[PDB]
Paper text:
The São Paulo MBL ([name]‐1) is widely distributed in South America, Europe and North America, in the Gram‐negative pathogen [name]. Like other B1 MBLs (NDM, VIM and IMP),10 [name]‐1 has a binuclear zinc center, but has loop characteristics of the B2 MBLs, suggesting it is a B1/B2 hybrid, which, consequently, may be challenging to inhibit. [name]‐1, like other B1 MBLs, has a di‐zinc ion active site with one zinc ion bound at a (normally tetrahedral) tri‐histidine site (Zn1) and one in a trigonal bipyramidal site (Zn2) comprised of conserved Asp, Cys, and His residues. [name]‐1 is distinguished from other B1 MBLs in possessing a “wall” of hydrophobic residues involving Phe57 and Tyr58 on its L3 loop, Phe79 on the loop connecting α5 and α1, and Phe151 and Tyr152 on the kinked α3 helix in the “closed” form, as well as Tyr228 on the opposite side of the active site cleft.
Residue numbers in the entry: 34 to 56, 58 to 63, 63Q, 64 to 209, 216 to 226, 230 to 253, 256 to 267, 296 to 316
Write the structure that this text describes.
């Protein structure tokens, strides 16, 4: 089933050398952890804050003994950039699009106390206020994307268009046939609409059909197969229809 971690994280194995770690205190946010054939560990997205992320990195160190860690932010929300403080502290190489870095820096200008009020309880508010999110150390041009090659094993980061957020990117692992679609994968309901482009979302999701994926991992909730994309398109087009 799963391994129980501190701060209400759970880790589930979905393939050889591939795990999903879920932050169950903060909106059941999913984090992909994949060990490459050459020993590099790639982490996609993040827990919301420092206690969760330290917990994640302790588990990565203990169970995978990485040669090197590369962390890829999926978008500027805290499930995305909330891990950067601890990723950096633990020596990981953090990456995001230039737009994600810009949006995180702008978000940091907002009054923190007001932002923390939308959280469930006092314990979570205190944890959020005890972390101070930072952008990634390394950036790529959003529309160009980024391809890593770890001893000829590729990891492809690409922008399919605005959907859940203006900056959402997906991460594809061709050898493992694994697509981390993040928070633009919404097979039942679209969720938080604040930064969304609902009109663009159907065509942005249509761009995910090209991937030869056996597993599609969403930003929240259970992962599935390529049908996760089909479902998302229908959910988004339903919302667009309701809109006029
Ligand atoms: Cl404000
Ligand atoms: Cl269909
Ligand atoms: Zn359990
Ligand atoms: Zn988000
Ligand atoms: Zn700090
Ligand atoms: Zn999310």
């Amino acid at each position: 089933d799963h391994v129980d971690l501190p701060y209400n994280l759970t880790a589930t194995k979905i393939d050889s050398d591939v795990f999903v770690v879920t932050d169950r205190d903060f909106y059941s946010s999913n984090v992909l952890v994949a060990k490459m054939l050459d020993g590099t560990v790639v982490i996609v997205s993040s827990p919301f804050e420092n206690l969760g992320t330290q917990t994640l990195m302790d588990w990565v160190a203990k169970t995978m003994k990485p040669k090197k860690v590369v962390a890829i932010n999926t978008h500027f929300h805290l499930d995305g950039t909330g891990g950067n403080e601890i990723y950096k502290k633990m020596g990981a190489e953090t990456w995001s699009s230039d737009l994600t870095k810009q949006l995180r820096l702008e978000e940091n200008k907002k009054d923190r106390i007001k932002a923390a009020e939308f959280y469930k309880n006092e314990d979570l508010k205190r944890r959020i206020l005890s972390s101070h999110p930072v952008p990634a150390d390394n950036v790529f041009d959003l529309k160009q994307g980024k391809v890593f090659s770890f001893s000829n094993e590729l990891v492809e980061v690409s922008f399919p268009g605005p959907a859940h957020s203006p900056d959402n990117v997906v991460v594809y692992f061709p050898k493992k046939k694994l697509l981390f679609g993040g928070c633009m994968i919404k097979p039942k309901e679209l969720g938080y609409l604040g930064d969304a482009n609902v009109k663009a979302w159907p065509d942005s999701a249509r761009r995910l059909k090209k991937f030869d994926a056996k597993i599609v991992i969403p930003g929240h909730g259970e992962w599935g197969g390529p049908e996760m994309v089909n479902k998302t398109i229908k959910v988004a087009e339903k919302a667009v229809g309701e809109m006029r």
